[PDB]
């Protein structure tokens, strides 16, 4: 049982490391996508402004 | 996107209309100037006639 408990603790620590790494990975991906989506929204709003400028003629 | 695509034809038409309007205005200006010159020549001729 001592051997089994040590093995279990090692694998549990491995899984904890895994969840931590995945949490950083998802936080980074989310930030990158937030920046890109803001870029897209800005592009769309500027395009709407352009469209009204051409209609103004 | 579709808005700008179809309205671009409208922009092209506006440019062409402005060009054609300028051309027609210049042509009518030339015609008016010619007729004015001929009328002036006739007026001076008739003024000489009246003086005589």
Give your account of this protein's structure.
The structure is cut from a larger assembly and holds 2 copies of chain A. Chain A is mainly alpha-helical and 57 residues long. The first copy, chain A, contains 1 helix and no strands. Chain A is rod-shaped and about 85 Å long. Chains A and B meet through α1 of A and α1 of B. Chain A: It is found in: Cytoplasm, Cytoskeleton. Chain A: It comes from Homo sapiens.
Quick structural gist:
This is part of a larger assembly, with 2 copies of chain A. By secondary structure, chain A is an all-alpha fold.
Q: Descriptors for this entry?
A:
57 residues, tropomyosin, contractile protein, part of a larger assembly, 1 helix, 2 chains, 0% strand, rod-shaped, troponin
Structural category of chain A is mainly alpha
H/E element string of chain A? H
Gyration radius of chain A, to the nearest Å?
Answer: 25 Å
Please bin the fraction of helical residues of chain A: over 70%
Secondary-structure topology with pairs:
This is part of a larger assembly, with two copies of chain A.
Chain A: H1 2-55
Subcellular location (chain B): Cytoplasm, Cytoskeleton
Region (Disordered) (chain B): 1-38
Biased composition (Basic and acidic residues) (chain B): 12-38
């Amino acid at each position: 049982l001592s051997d089994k408990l040590k093995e279990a603790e090692t694998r549990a620590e491995f899984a904890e490391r895994s969840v931590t790494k995945l949490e950083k990975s998802i936080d980074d991906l989310e930030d990158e996508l937030y920046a890109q989506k803001l870029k897209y929204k800005a592009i769309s709003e500027e395009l709407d402004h352009a469209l009204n400028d051409m209609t103004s003629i | 996107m579709d808005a700008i695509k179809k309205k671009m034809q409208m922009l092209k038409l506006d440019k062409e209309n402005a060009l054609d309007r300028a051309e027609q205005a210049e042509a009518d200006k030339k015609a008016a100037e010619d007729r004015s010159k001929q009328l002036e020549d006739e007026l001076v001729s008739l003024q000489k006639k009246l003086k005589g």
